Amino acid sequence: GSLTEDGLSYKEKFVVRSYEVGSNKTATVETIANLLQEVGCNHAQSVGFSTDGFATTTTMRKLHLIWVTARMHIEIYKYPAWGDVVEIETWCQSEGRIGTRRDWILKDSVTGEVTGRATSKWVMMNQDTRRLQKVSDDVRDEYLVFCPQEPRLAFPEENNRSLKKIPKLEDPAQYSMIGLKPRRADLDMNQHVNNVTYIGWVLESIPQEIVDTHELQVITLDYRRECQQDDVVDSLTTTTSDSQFLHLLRLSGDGQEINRGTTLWRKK
Amino acid sequence: GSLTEDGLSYKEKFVVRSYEVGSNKTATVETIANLLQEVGCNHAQSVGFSTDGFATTTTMRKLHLIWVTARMHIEIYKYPAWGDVVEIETWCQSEGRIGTRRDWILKDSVTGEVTGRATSKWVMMNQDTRRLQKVSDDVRDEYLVFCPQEPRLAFPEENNRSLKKIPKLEDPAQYSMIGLKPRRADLDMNQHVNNVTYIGWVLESIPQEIVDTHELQVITLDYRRECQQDDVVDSLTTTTSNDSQFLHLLRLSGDGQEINRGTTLWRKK
Numbered sequence: 001g002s003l004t005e006d007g008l009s010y011k012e013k014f015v016v017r018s019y020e021v022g023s024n025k026t027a028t029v030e031t032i033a034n035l036l037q038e039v040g041c042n043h044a045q046s047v048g049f050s051t052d053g054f055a056t057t058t059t060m061r062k063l064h065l066i067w068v069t070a071r072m073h074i075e076i077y078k079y080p081a082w083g084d085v086v087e088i089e090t091w092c093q094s095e096g097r098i099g100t101r102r103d104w105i106l107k108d109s110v111t112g113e114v115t116g117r118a119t120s121k122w123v124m125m126n127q128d129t130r131r132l133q134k135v136s137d138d139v140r141d142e143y144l145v146f147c148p149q150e151p152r153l154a155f156p157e158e159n160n161r162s163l164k165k166i167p168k169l170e171d172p173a174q175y176s177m178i179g180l181k182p183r184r185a186d187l188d189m190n191q192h193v194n195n196v197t198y199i200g201w202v203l204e205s206i207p208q209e210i211v212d213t214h215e216l217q218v219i220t221l222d223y224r225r226e227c228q229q230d231d232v233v234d235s236l237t238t239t240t241s242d243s244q245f246l247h248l249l250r251l252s253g254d255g256q257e258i259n260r261g262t263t264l265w266r267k268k
Numbered sequence: 269g270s271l272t273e274d275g276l277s278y279k280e281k282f283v284v285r286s287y288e289v290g291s292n293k294t295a296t297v298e299t300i301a302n303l304l305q306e307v308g309c310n311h312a313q314s315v316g317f318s319t320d321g322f323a324t325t326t327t328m329r330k331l332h333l334i335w336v337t338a339r340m341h342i343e344i345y346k347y348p349a350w351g352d353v354v355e356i357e358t359w360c361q362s363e364g365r366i367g368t369r370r371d372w373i374l375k376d377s378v379t380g381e382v383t384g385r386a387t388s389k390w391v392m393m394n395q396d397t398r399r400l401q402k403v404s405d406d407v408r409d410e411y412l413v414f415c416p417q418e419p420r421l422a423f424p425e426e427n428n429r430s431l432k433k434i435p436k437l438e439d440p441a442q443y444s445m446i447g448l449k450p451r452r453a454d455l456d457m458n459q460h461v462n463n464v465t466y467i468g469w470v471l472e473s474i475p476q477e478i479v480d481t482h483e484l485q486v487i488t489l490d491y492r493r494e495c496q497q498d499d500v501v502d503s504l505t506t507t508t509s510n511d512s513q514f515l516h517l518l519r520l521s522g523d524g525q526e527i528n529r530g531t532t533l534w535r536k537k
């Protein structure tokens with residue numbers, strides 16, 4: 001991998017592995033999401049920020065501050081097959097005092113064609129109190145020289161799917177997968193549940209018939225709270241319709257919301 | 269990746285990824301086991317066998333025969349860190365009519381030093397009936413030209429750990445993790461639970477205090493039955509012992525039917 005010529009974005013190539021593919025012999029959306037995380041981490045390392053997924057500055061580390069994912073939006077046109085080489089380009093942009101955005105473009109290495117695109121919204125939070133805060137001028141100027149100045153968006157279309165508000169699923173859910181627990185493989189180096197595990201948990205309540213007859217085209221997921229290493233999660237899904245679904249992940253006990261999302265599936 | 273000069277083994281390099289590391293900032297044993305699986309799959313593809321993890325011939329496919337893992341033995345000396353390049357070399361050898369063996373050597377790309385080694389025993393089974401069968405001379409002859417003729421073993425030592433018999437854990441277990449279920453990420457392209465998920469499930473019943481003060485040095489795991497996509501598993505562990513050793517059992521939550529048994533050796537950090 002490497003920063004591009006102008007140093008304002010980062011590119012990396014990946015060869016899809018045998019254990020990374022699903023029933024269609026192509027990469028799963030969770031394999032894709034882990035690759036987005038990997039290219040983001042290598043971009044942060046290349047310019048001197050932390051490499052723990054939080055991309056912090058020395059100023060942020062002294063005032064125990066981290067960047068945390070608020071929303072993840074992924075649209076895939078073609079999932080790469082086993083042995084295929086996929087090239088991913090990523091960049092960040094500041095969004096005023098609200099937070100920051102990281103975008104990605106996935107291309108097939110042989111054809112040069114765009115096979116997918118993703119966007120994520122990040123907010124600043126104190127790692128101990130979990131309290132969010134607006135981005136200061138000093139902890140914004142530090143990132144400015146590593147981002148494009150003019151807007152560069154993976155999803156430019158006005159009124160696009162990545163910015164739509166997601167409602168709360170009402171009980172009873174049409175489908176559910178209850179009692180989901182993380183194991184050590186679901187944790188990151190800081191012992192927190194990896195952001196991609198939540199995507200898997202969301203997808204657990206989609207019936208196998210849909211997975212067998214359709215391909216996932218779009219997934220938008222809002223992150224509200226963490227599942228701790230010892231928490232248990234219930235995954236709920238209701239059809240809102242192409243097939244579209246509304247999703248909710250909540251803690252098994254008290255029903256506390258951890259995530260909400262939407263998925264769009266096209267017939268194979 | 270590529271077959272080596274003599275065409276009797278296969279090598280591939282891997283750069284350790286950010287999501288592949290544990291609390292020590294080094295690759296987990298499950299990341300290592302998936303890489304062993306990936307290099308084995310690329311070796312099978314390079315010479316014309318199936319690429320679904322079963323490494324079958326056209327003769328085996330018409331008979332609905334597959335190779336399945338009976339035992340997996342992994343010994344790690346140094347886990348590679350995030351961003352490190354690890355080179356893995358793999359080869360197979362026939363073991364008469366009993367089955368076949370696949371071996372691996374893990375090296376650090378920069379130093380050339382051996383950082384780990386692994387060996388696995390495979391048996392032939394009918395995909396549908398689950399009935400094992402001894403290897404025929406015609407099946408054995410199709411693989412002979414892709415394997416070294418003289419013995420080449422990742423674990424040559426006289427009384428080495430890879431061949432020790434594993435006893436059955438007696439109730440009550442000292443530790444347990446109950447109600448383990450696979451999710452879609454745990455499945456392979458054929459919708460079966462990936463062999464590496466069982467390693468994770470075994471490790472789930474090791475207390476967090478051990479994981480925090482020790483590093484896993486050796487793991488030997490025997491595979492007896494599959495966990496189906498809709499089965500629930502209980503993981504049991506009892507200490508058998510600086511070094512700490514444990515006996516492990518994975519069984520189906522309902523009837524207590526054994527799916528795996530194993531041993532792990534941990535050394536103080």
Ligand SMILES: CC1=NN(c2ccccc2)C(=O)C1
Nearest residue numbers: 044055092093094100143146
């Ligand atoms: C604006 C922001 N830019 N970045 C960033 C991160 C890594 C590489 C380049 C830029 C943030 O984390 C926030």
Ligand SMILES: CC1=NN(c2ccccc2)C(=O)C1
Nearest residue numbers: 068069070195223224225226
């Ligand atoms: C905004 C927020 N995002 N998150 C979050 C939770 C889990 C994983 C990633 C991010 C919060 O806790 C609040």
Ligand SMILES: CC1=NN(c2ccccc2)C(=O)C1
Nearest residue numbers: 312323360361362368411414
């Ligand atoms: C003996 C055996 N050799 N092999 C094998 C597989 C792939 C490449 C080279 C060889 C078996 O599956 C059994």
Ligand SMILES: CC1=NN(c2ccccc2)C(=O)C1
Nearest residue numbers: 336337338463491492493494
């Ligand atoms: C010998 C056997 N190995 N196995 C097995 C089970 C799960 C994964 C891999 C292999 C059997 O069912 C019998």
